Amino acid sequence: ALQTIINARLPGEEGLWQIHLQDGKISAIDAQSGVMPITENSLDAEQGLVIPPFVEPHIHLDTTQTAGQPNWNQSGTLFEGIERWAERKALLTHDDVKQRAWQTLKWQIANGIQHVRTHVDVSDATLTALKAMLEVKQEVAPWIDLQIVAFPQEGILSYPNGEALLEEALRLGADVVGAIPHFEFTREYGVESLHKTFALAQKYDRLIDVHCDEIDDEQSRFVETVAALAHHEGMGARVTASHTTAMHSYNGAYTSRLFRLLKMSGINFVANPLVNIHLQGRFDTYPKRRGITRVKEMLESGINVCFGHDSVFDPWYPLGTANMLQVLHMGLHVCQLMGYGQINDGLNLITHHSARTLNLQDYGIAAGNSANLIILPAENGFDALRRQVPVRYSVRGGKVIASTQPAQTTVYLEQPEAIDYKR
């Protein structure tokens, strides 16, 4: 079994480091004064970057891999997506959900993702997708720690038996309580739905992740209730507000007042760049707003924010290979986090900040933690992002669970020359 990771670079640290492993955990981390020789039981990072695993804080595994079945979304709109999904209803079975979820999970394992939070639609009396996902969670456990959010997609108060079904999902084992206040019939139902969500989270000791203000409506302010209730209950660390795309459209004075509460509350925020740029701004003609939440300002204020993929290869988002560096690339561009340090520090948005969002208790390259880490064939976060590098090795419990042999590119000039896209 592997005993050491050598010649590793660490974000924010100078030089090379050696990570000692024992009994599936990291026993010690020591600085090197030069390059160490390889040997039996040593995994050579080759001066590449070593980081804790990538994290997917927001994905819908119940709908993944269904694009084009039975028909393709040709307009690309949300409206048509709903119609295309409806045409596939006859194929939505226990086994179908498990097969598709596992296909995307394998791409995630290949991409160094060891922690995933999936929302599962529980606005279904049969709870078909939820029952399937609970089995998938157990099956994939050796490779990925999967959290399941009971997501009442059609609303809690605006759908028949919505609250009873949400609670049933928690009784069956869902890890997180979801909500979608802006989709409820009225603002009052929206606010009330959040009180019910928090009461359920406290009753069952579960986390909360709300699809919050995902709409280009400057009056959609459910985020202040999410933060206020979290502050009142002293549970900010266990609470997440996903999307908050309406914040992109708020006036600055209200946003400034709100930020004081967001910081005090300690809640987490998830932005989903690939999907937000695609589905937001659809009611504008020109100019067209970007529609991503205030990521740059959150970072400047010390508010925890991170990035999710949201959807993969389905009616709502036809693209994706479940790659977090690709999600990060889009977010840095749309949010204009394009200075060198902003890009280099970008890795935090898909590693540490996401681990905090999932309330993980065993995460990070530190002595005593499980030996879960990945190796990128790049010098730092900037280099990894610019070249969109694959994950050379993914290690979990001190064992290799994925590896990618890099592509090899050659140009035939006066003589053959290898191209690695470095200067």
- Positions annotated as catalytic residues are 214
**Has 58 been labeled as part of a binding site?**
yes
* Least Cβ distance, residue 259 to a second copy (angstroms): 11
Closer by beta carbon to a second copy, 74 or else 251: 251
Asked if residues 391 and 375 have their Cβ atoms less than 8 Å apart, the reply is yes
Contact status: 261 vs a second copy (CB under 8 A): yes
Contact status: 29 vs a second copy (CB under 8 A): no
Total of residues contacting a second copy (CB under 8 A): 32
Residues in CB range of 413: below 8 A, 6 or more apart: none
Asked if residues 244 and 253 have their Cβ atoms less than 8 Å apart, the reply is no
* Least Cβ distance, residue 269 to a second copy (angstroms): 17
Look up residue 231 and give its two tokens: 């502050």
Residues 73-112 binding a second copy (CB under 8 A) are: none
Helices (runs of H) and strands (runs of E) counted in the chain: 13, 18
Stretch that binds a second copy, among 6-14, 101-109, 188-196, 336-344 (CB under 8 A): 188-196
Residue 218 parent element (H or E): none
Among 100, 206, 221, 248, binds a second copy (CB under 8 A): 221
* Least Cβ distance, residue 260 to a second copy (angstroms): 9
Among 39, 161, 256, 409, binds a second copy (CB under 8 A): 256
Asked if residues 178 and 214 have their Cβ atoms less than 8 Å apart, the reply is no
The string of DSSP codes covering 295-364 is HHHHHHTT--EEE--B--SBTTB------HHHHHHHHHHHTT--SHHHHHGGGGGGTHHHHHHTT-SS-S
Closer by beta carbon to a second copy, 186 or else 409: 186
Look up residue 339 and give its two tokens: 């200075």
**Has 153 been labeled as part of a binding site?**
yes
Asked if residues 227 and 261 have their Cβ atoms less than 8 Å apart, the reply is yes
Contact status: 172 vs a second copy (CB under 8 A): no
Among 114, 118, 153, 225, binds a second copy (CB under 8 A): 225
Judged on CB neighbours under 10 Å (0-12, 13-18, 19+), 286 is exposed
Among 73, 147, 153, 220, binds a second copy (CB under 8 A): 220
**Has 316 been labeled as part of a binding site?**
yes
* Least Cβ distance, residue 318 to a second copy (angstroms): 21
Residues in CB range of 79: below 8 A, 6 or more apart: none
**Has 310 been labeled as part of a binding site?**
yes
From residue 203, alpha-carbon distances to 152, 167, 170, 198 in Å are 18, 10, 10, 9
* Least Cβ distance, residue 1 to a second copy (angstroms): 52
Among 93, 161, 219, 301, binds a second copy (CB under 8 A): 219
**Has 143 been labeled as part of a binding site?**
no
Angle between helices 187-204 and 222-233 (to 10 degrees): 30
Beta strands in 213-255 (DSSP E): 239-243
* Least Cβ distance, residue 90 to a second copy (angstroms): 24
**Has 96 been labeled as part of a binding site?**
no
Kindly list the residues in this chain that would bind a second copy in the complex (CB under 8 A): 158, 182-183, 185-189, 191, 215-221, 224-225, 227-228, 231, 251-257, 261, 282-284
Question: Can you say which residues are annotated as belonging to the binding site?
Answer: 58, 60, 153, 211, 310, 316
Question: Can you say which residues are annotated as belonging to the binding site for Fe(2+)?
Answer: 58, 60, 211, 310
